[PDB]
Amino acid sequence: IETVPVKLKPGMDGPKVKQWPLTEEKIKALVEICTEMEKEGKISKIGPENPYNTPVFAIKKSTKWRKLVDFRELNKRTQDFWEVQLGIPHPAGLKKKKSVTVLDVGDAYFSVPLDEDFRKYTAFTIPSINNETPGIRYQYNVLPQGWKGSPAIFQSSMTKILEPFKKQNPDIVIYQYMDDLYVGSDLEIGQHRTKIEELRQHLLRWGLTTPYELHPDKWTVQPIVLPEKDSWTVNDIQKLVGKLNWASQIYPGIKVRQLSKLLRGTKALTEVIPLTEEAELELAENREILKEPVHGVYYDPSKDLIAEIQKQGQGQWTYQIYQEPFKNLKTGKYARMRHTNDVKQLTEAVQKITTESIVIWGKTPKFKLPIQKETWETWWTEYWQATWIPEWEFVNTPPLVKLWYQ
Amino acid sequence: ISPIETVPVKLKPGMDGPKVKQWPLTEEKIKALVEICTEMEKEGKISKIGPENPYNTPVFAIKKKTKWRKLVDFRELNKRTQDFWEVQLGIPHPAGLKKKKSVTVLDVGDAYFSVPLDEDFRKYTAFTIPSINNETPGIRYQYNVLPQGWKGSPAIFQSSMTKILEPFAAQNPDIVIYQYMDDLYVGSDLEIGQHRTKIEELRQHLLRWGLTTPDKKHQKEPPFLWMGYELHPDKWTVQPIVLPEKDSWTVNDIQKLVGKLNWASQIYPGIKVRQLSKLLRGTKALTEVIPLTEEAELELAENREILKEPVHGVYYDPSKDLIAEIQKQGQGQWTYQIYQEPFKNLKTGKYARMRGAHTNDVKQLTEAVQKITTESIVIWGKTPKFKLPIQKETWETWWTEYWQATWIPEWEFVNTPPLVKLWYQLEKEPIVGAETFYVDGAANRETKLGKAGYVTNKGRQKVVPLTNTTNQKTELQAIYLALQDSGLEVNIVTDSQYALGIIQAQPDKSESELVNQIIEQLIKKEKVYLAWVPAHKGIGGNEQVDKLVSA
Numbered sequence A: 001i002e003t004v005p006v007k008l009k010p011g012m013d014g015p016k017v018k019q020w021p022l023t024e025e026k027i028k029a030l031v032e033i034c035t036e037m038e039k040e041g042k043i044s045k046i047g048p049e050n051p052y053n054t055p056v057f058a059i060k061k062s063t064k065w066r067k068l069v070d071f072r073e074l075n076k077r078t079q080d081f082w083e084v085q086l087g088i089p090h091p092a093g094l095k096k097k098k099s100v101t102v103l104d105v106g107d108a109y110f111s112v113p114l115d116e117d118f119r120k121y122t123a124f125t126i127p128s129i130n131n132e133t134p135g136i137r138y139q140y141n142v143l144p145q146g147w148k149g150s151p152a153i154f155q156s157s158m159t160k161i162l163e164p165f166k167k168q169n170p171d172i173v174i175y176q177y178m179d180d181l182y183v184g185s186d187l188e189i190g191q192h193r194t195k196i197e198e199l200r201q202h203l204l205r206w207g208l209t210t211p212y213e214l215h216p217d218k219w220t221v222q223p224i225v226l227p228e229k230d231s232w233t234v235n236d237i238q239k240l241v242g243k244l245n246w247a248s249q250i251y252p253g254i255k256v257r258q259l260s261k262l263l264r265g266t267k268a269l270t271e272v273i274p275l276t277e278e279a280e281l282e283l284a285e286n287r288e289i290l291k292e293p294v295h296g297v298y299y300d301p302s303k304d305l306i307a308e309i310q311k312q313g314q315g316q317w318t319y320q321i322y323q324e325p326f327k328n329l330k331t332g333k334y335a336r337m338r339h340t341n342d343v344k345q346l347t348e349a350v351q352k353i354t355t356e357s358i359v360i361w362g363k364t365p366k367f368k369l370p371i372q373k374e375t376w377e378t379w380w381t382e383y384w385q386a387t388w389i390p391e392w393e394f395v396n397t398p399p400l401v402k403l404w405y406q
Numbered sequence B: 001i002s003p004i005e006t007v008p009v010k011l012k013p014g015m016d017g018p019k020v021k022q023w024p025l026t027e028e029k030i031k032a033l034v035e036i037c038t039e040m041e042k043e044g045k046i047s048k049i050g051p052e053n054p055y056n057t058p059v060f061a062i063k064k065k066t067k068w069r070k071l072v073d074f075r076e077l078n079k080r081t082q083d084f085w086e087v088q089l090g091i092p093h094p095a096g097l098k099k100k101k102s103v104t105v106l107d108v109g110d111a112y113f114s115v116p117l118d119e120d121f122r123k124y125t126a127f128t129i130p131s132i133n134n135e136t137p138g139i140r141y142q143y144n145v146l147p148q149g150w151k152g153s154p155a156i157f158q159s160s161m162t163k164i165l166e167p168f169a170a171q172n173p174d175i176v177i178y179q180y181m182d183d184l185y186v187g188s189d190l191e192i193g194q195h196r197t198k199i200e201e202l203r204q205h206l207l208r209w210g211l212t213t214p215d216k217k218h219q220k221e222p223p224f225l226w227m228g229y230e231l232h233p234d235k236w237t238v239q240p241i242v243l244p245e246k247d248s249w250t251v252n253d254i255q256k257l258v259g260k261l262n263w264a265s266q267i268y269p270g271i272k273v274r275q276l277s278k279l280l281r282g283t284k285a286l287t288e289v290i291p292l293t294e295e296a297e298l299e300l301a302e303n304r305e306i307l308k309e310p311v312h313g314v315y316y317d318p319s320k321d322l323i324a325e326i327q328k329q330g331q332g333q334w335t336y337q338i339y340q341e342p343f344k345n346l347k348t349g350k351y352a353r354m355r356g357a358h359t360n361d362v363k364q365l366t367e368a369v370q371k372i373t374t375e376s377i378v379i380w381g382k383t384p385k386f387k388l389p390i391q392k393e394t395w396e397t398w399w400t401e402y403w404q405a406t407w408i409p410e411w412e413f414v415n416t417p418p419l420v421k422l423w424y425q426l427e428k429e430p431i432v433g434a435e436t437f438y439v440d441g442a443a444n445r446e447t448k449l450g451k452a453g454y455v456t457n458k459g460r461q462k463v464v465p466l467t468n469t470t471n472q473k474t475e476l477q478a479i480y481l482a483l484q485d486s487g488l489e490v491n492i493v494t495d496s497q498y499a500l501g502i503i504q505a506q507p508d509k510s511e512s513e514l515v516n517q518i519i520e521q522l523i524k525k526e527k528v529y530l531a532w533v534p535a536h537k538g539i540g541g542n543e544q545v546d547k548l549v550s551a
């Protein structure tokens, strides 16, 4: 076949990222996978004149391991090739559909050869234990999974293969983000999964092997909830006054005068204050301003998406997506009904938020994670199932905004 | 035309080879170069080149007080040579080595000179022996092998050695070979004679590829002085530590000292370096004299006593479990040992990072576990069982209320005090029948004067004046004042997001003395509930103490 010429941004060097240490279990699994990938010609061993590196991880998507390559750095340095040039446009309707199924189509890329000049930039290293050996060094001969240039190069073949199916089903929306197809329809569930199986069989008969559905209709921005007590203490009103004051930055028009009036004096926190008629109306009026949605919040495609996550205890995790502070494009809550632990829940929550973000805007958000860097770097693969990896940083400051979003 | 296959080398794009001129030298130093070069030329290592080669690189002739050695300053060529895959930055840790019946250490002689250099790159290695007082043109040579001191030599040698070793490694699967620099470390669990036969085979296998190796009479014997370690057949330890005694200490003196102490921490249990390290905080210059703290003097003395005794570590058995145990040594300082059998320690270590101004013990214990986890993965390829002096009730309460996600390994409680515990727990609901203090504090940013006050439900009011503080430090001193003048149960109400955040984190050790005093009060108290309200919003108790402190 014919390789598509690939170039990095002019004046940009390849990735030189550190390979993380791995357990012997994951190392052996990587050597098995790569030995057979080498036999199949998809990767080749490289010499010391190749200085580039990209980290590799062993996960499970499950008795069989799989290799996951963190191409985040190479993707940043190739952005001219997978965006602007050969960019795959994002349909605004996928979020509107009632059912969306995600299809792993990443195995297609291993047919297409990679530009021989660009292959040195995909170099990776299987690490040794205790620095006893130099790592095992490979580079890719075919389009690698996780590199954003792989779906861009394959885009023409994918459009061709899907052209009959899109003809037969004109109201089904199909969007490709990296290694996955997102297929959305307003059909009935069992009728929707039939169309999904048809598409799968269509793909399989054309040589594209493929191995829980989303429902964007239910998603929304959550409204701020206020409590309802049968008897309110001074402390209860204070927290009620503080929460309404925090919301005064986003929703204009929340009033606290009648509520503050009930606390005039130097009262004991434990004292029981009756809700006057005038304050009950203010609390009732404010319960309606929070029902209405905010205005003026528009997604800018030129700006990064940011996702913050708070641990609320009891397996619950709130989150907010935004681009400029206090302008939340999406808020939501995740709930682990599980055998669970904090890392498993955060890892699962990050994948849910990223998938929701892929559906709505077509790009992954940057995560501010409430966890210590080294702990995340040690255990994040233990529950990682997606084939992509978002950017993240570690918020060491606590949220006193924990109970606000609770 | 060499058996070993060359690695293709390129210069950085847009650069040319070095054109550095050769400085004139003595007729006696020229005599040394001329003789060394004709021997290197006879050995094919270098070749004379025509006049068309436009590149040069200086050469010098040194000797130590005595055959001379040739020295080439490749600094300019190195700058223009492409990058290579990074050679082993880290080295193996002795506690990760698996115990072997026999172990052999072989060093490769003229390692770099035994590997060919890419033909197209040889032009850029040209150098010149100077003629006596420029009487004639100098002799132009170039390298055909990996030059010593060139950027690419270590990486290309290591790869060439790897490939050269692959045939022998197939026909001998039980023999284990480790590579480091010009060394091979060979270990087998075969019979000493059988192992000795195999070594002699590998020597000839390497000699056939051109790699000189020592004979059985010239091979080093245990104990091996390897990278600051002593390797005995059944034990490892560090090489002897020499902590100097000095009347005055420079910044550089202390940096040497903490380095040696850090080095001792891997096998010597109980080493502490925090107080000494604090001296280097903001250390401007290496020559700056640092007055030793009384705490640094005691820390150093304690270290001297531990080092007086001798300790050793054991090698690794993959068939026995890996166990890690942590002990608290002092406020902020922790120590650990990792062992498979009860009193045979593989290695030891410390952890003493505060990771911020204020922390708690359970958080620091979790961080020490995290540091051991990363270290066990690097050294042994797995995480160990943990024996920890904390009870499940303590840790479970903490990690459940802690706002960060945390991974708690499988661990057993070992009752060997000091046990890690929660010294206090704030109330989660306000307290009935406890006095409600409304605290506030203020500070003029210019004059740096301040005050902290309280107003209570029972009608009590107080203001204490403050000399040199900030708005933040007074907001903390206002909470301290309410704790000082309250019963065993108190409800405190502040408008300070700063002070609430510090207290809600429930620290038990801080580098601020005021916070340490609040911590002392929080312990003595039976029930403390801390509440927050938006400032300047007319809330009853906050408005009064705000007006009081503002006057």
Ligand SMILES: N#Cc1cc(Cl)cc(Oc2ccc(Cl)cc2OCCn2cc(Cl)c(=O)[nH]c2=O)c1
Pocket (backbone or CB within 6 Å): B092, B097, B098, B099, B100, B101, B102, B103, B104, B105, B176, B177, B178, B185, B186, B187, B188, B222, B224, B225, B226, B231, B232, B233, B234, B315
């Ligand atoms: N100098 C040096 C040096 C450096 C390194 Cl990186 C390794 C090394 O030795 C081994 C090499 C390979 C293996 Cl597979 C095990 C080794 O040692 C395992 C531990 N041990 C060490 C000695 Cl000295 C011994 O007599 N018996 C024994 O069991 C020697």
